Structures are given as C-alpha cells and as structure tokens.
Design a protein around this ligand. Sequence first.
Ligand SMILES: C[N+]1(C)[C@@H]2C[C@@H](OC(=O)C(O)(c3cccs3)c3cccs3)C[C@H]1[C@@H]1O[C@@H]12
Ligand SMILES: CCCCCCCC/C=C/CCCCCCCC(=O)OC[C@H](O)CO
Ligand SMILES: CCCCCCCC/C=C\CCCCCCCC(=O)O
Length: 416
Amino acid sequence: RLWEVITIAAVTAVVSLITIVGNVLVMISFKVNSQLKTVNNYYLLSLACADLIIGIFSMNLYTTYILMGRWALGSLACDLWLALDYVASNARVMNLLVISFDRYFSITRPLTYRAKRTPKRAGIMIGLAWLISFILWAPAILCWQYLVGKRTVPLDECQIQFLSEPTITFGTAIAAFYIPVSVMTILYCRIYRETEKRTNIFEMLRIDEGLRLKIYKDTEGYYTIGIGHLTKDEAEKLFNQDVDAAVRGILRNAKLKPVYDSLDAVRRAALINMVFQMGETGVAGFTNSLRMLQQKRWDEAAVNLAKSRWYNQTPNRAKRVITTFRTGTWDAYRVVLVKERKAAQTLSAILLAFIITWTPYNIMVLVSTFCDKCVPVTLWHLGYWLCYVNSTVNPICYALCNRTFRKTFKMLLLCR
Ligand SMILES: C[N+]1(C)[C@@H]2C[C@@H](OC(=O)C(O)(c3cccs3)c3cccs3)C[C@H]1[C@@H]1O[C@@H]12
Ligand SMILES: CCCCCCCC/C=C/CCCCCCCC(=O)OC[C@H](O)CO
Ligand SMILES: CCCCCCCC/C=C\CCCCCCCC(=O)O
C-alpha cells in the first residue's frame, strides 16, 4: 500500500505540475504576444483560469483525500474544496458552450453578430459563465445541509449531500453534461459543415451573407432565410436558383451586360455579390465604376468604389469585393476561410479533450442510475481524476492546433 501511495503521489504531482506550467504558459503567451489578444482567445484565457484552479487546488486536495483514506481537514474545508471544484468545472462547461455559440454565430451571422464581436461582449459572456456557475453550485454545496435541517455527510468522508440519490445525480448529469455536450456537438457539426468546401461563389456569399436555417427578420424587417433570400439544411439548390436569377437579370440589363461580359469569372462573382447585396438597379447606379471596370482599370475602379455609400455601410464586405475587382483573385475570401478553418480545428480539439476526459464519470452516473450502487468507488475515483486531466490536456490542445500559440510557447520555453 505504501508503494502505491508513493506512486500515486508522484504521478499526480507530475500531472499537477504539467497542468500549472501549461496554463501559466497560456497566460504568459496571451500577455506577451499581441497577435494572440483576439476575442476568441479571451474565452481560452477563462478556460486557462479554470484549469489553473483545477491544477493547483483541486488535484492536490483530491489526491491527499484519496491517499489519506479520509478527509482530515474539517467539514468547512471539504465544502469549500467541493464548491471550488464544481464551480470551476461548471465554469469550464459554460465557457465551452459560449465558445461554441460564438464560433457558430460568427459563421452564420456576419452583420448581427460577427461585426459586433468586441472583447467586452466576450467578457460579459465569460463573467456570466463564472457568476452562474458560482450562484448555482456554491449555495447548493454550502447550504443544502441548512436547507434540509441536518448534515448527513459522514465525518470521515467528503461528498455532496443531494448527489447521493441516483435520480438527482442523473438529472444533474443530463442538465449539466449530456445536454451541453449535445448542444456543442450540434453546433460544431454545423461549423464543420461550413468548413469542408473550397473557395467558391457559395462560400463568398456565405461569408458576406451568413447562412440561417430558420426564417428570420433582416435589417429592414422582411422575412428572409438562408443566404439573404425572401426552413431546411440544403439551401445549395436555392442558392443556385438565386445566382441563376441574378445572372439572368444582369445579362438583361443595359448597364450591366457589357461589363459582365468583359470581366473575369472572379469579377463576375463580385458583380453577382453586389447584385445580391443591392440589386440590379443599385449596381446599375455605379455607371462610372462599371465603365472603369470594363476598361480593365482595376486600381482606378477600386479607388472610385471606395468613395461610395456602399463602402461606408459595410466596410469589410465592400473591401473584400473591391479587392476581388482589383486583383482578380479569391485571396480576400481565402484569408477568412483559412481563419475560420483554424478556429474550427481549435474548437474541435478542446471539445474532444472535454468529452473524452469527462465521458467515463458521466457514464458511471448513468449506470449507477440504472443499478443499485454497482459502480465501485475505485471507478468513481478514476473517473473524477480523469475529468481533472482535461485541465492538463487543454494547453497541449492549444499547442497542437494553433501555430501562433505553438510559436509563442517555443519562444517562451527556449527563452528567445
Ligand atoms: C471532476 N469534477 C471536478 C466533479 C465531477 C464531474 O462531474 C460531472 O461530470 C457532472 O456532470 C456531474 C457530477 C455529479 C452529477 S453530474 C457535473 C457537475 C458539475 C458540472 S458537470 C466533473 C467535474 C465537476 O465538478 C464535478
Ligand atoms: C468565483 C465567482 C466569480 C463570479 C464572477 C466574478 C468575476 C467575474 C470576472 C470577469 C472578468 C471577465 C472580463 C474580462 C474578460 C475580457 C474583457 C476584456 O476586455 O479584458 C481585457 C484585458 O486584456 C483582459 O485582462
Ligand atoms: C448547465 C449547468 C447546469 C448546472 C446544474 C446545477 C445543479 C443544481 C442542483 C441543486 C441546486 C438546488 C437548489 C440549491 C439552493 C441553494 C440554497 C440551498 O441549498 O438551500
């Protein structure tokens, strides 16, 4: 048993040190590389805070508890450790949920969500995650004994009072793990479905006009759906019909036909994008720019289009379309596509780490719901510690799927 105690203590000390060093590296990287100070990474910083809490306090307190075979720190210390544990881990779950929704709405809502993403909005979401986790788990763990009247926790053990019943534990697993995991998986499936296709007209108009599966009200209040069209998943045929109608309307327009016949395929795609945004009449209003584009004067037409209401209403979309006219390449949209693909890979890595490390404990909860104390305490301990290991593996996720994080980590480690 002594050999076992030494081995467990050594392994868990090593794992705790790796967790601490990794999340401190994440924080130092966020601090000393301005290229990492993006809206996406503030959520990752929140995750690193939860993981550092897990690595310093949770791992060491839990391992001392299991090695001593009892709790020898007092009931208040047990309740404080359990509260810290459950609040920080629920905060991690909420942070993963808000990361999922942030990425999803960035992909699907460019005007209503993506153009409005500031670090303060992200900080609101982060603080709400932490505050809701706190007000849900700390009062329960600390005052359920006062709610029932008596404290039915054994003096030598450290467990939460109400989570002994299998039905309450099952409800907690459903509302706290299974429903969040289902939501994150559905959101990631949608994000991934929008990251398989190469750079084309569909992806261009999706970047400019996000894809919505449900009928919504546009900026003017009209019932639009899909890619700016006025409830399904295969809107590709609808998109083809709309771009077919757009080409047919451009070819039947006096000001748009010669320029459309003279432009490259990429520039015809830019013209179709402008027709999608404004219409045939709106694009026909740019007679000067159309004559500049028909005469292959790309720089002149670009600087002429940068002086319109279209450039001031939507700066990013107009800049991309103007760059497409000016260069005749997809690079302005290629850049957004590779950025979104990188974000998606990072999201998938952190989601898989979470799901893999936390799945055994919650499967044990399910089995214990459908049996009578059949899951041994050894397995409970292993599943608990495995959920801790999420906090250890998350910085390795950042290092394996973000080249900026990887470069900053190598700079810090080698002390460059
Ligand atoms: C190792 N933990 C620190 C403890 C045990 C695990 O708990 C979980 O996986 C559970 O689904 C459940 C525990 C009991 C019933 S359902 C969650 C609890 C809070 C959010 S999700 C993971 C985390 C969480 O802080 C608890
Ligand atoms: C334990 C229960 C705690 C209950 C909740 C109390 C704490 C809430 C704090 C939220 C800070 C999040 C806001 C900061 C996140 C990003 C916003 C921002 O702009 O931060 C810029 C700066 O660079 C970043 O250090
Ligand atoms: C998505 C995460 C879901 C989190 C689920 C939280 C589980 C809540 C379980 C029990 C809380 C019961 C109400 C506690 C009241 C606090 C004061 C008291 O204990 O009397």
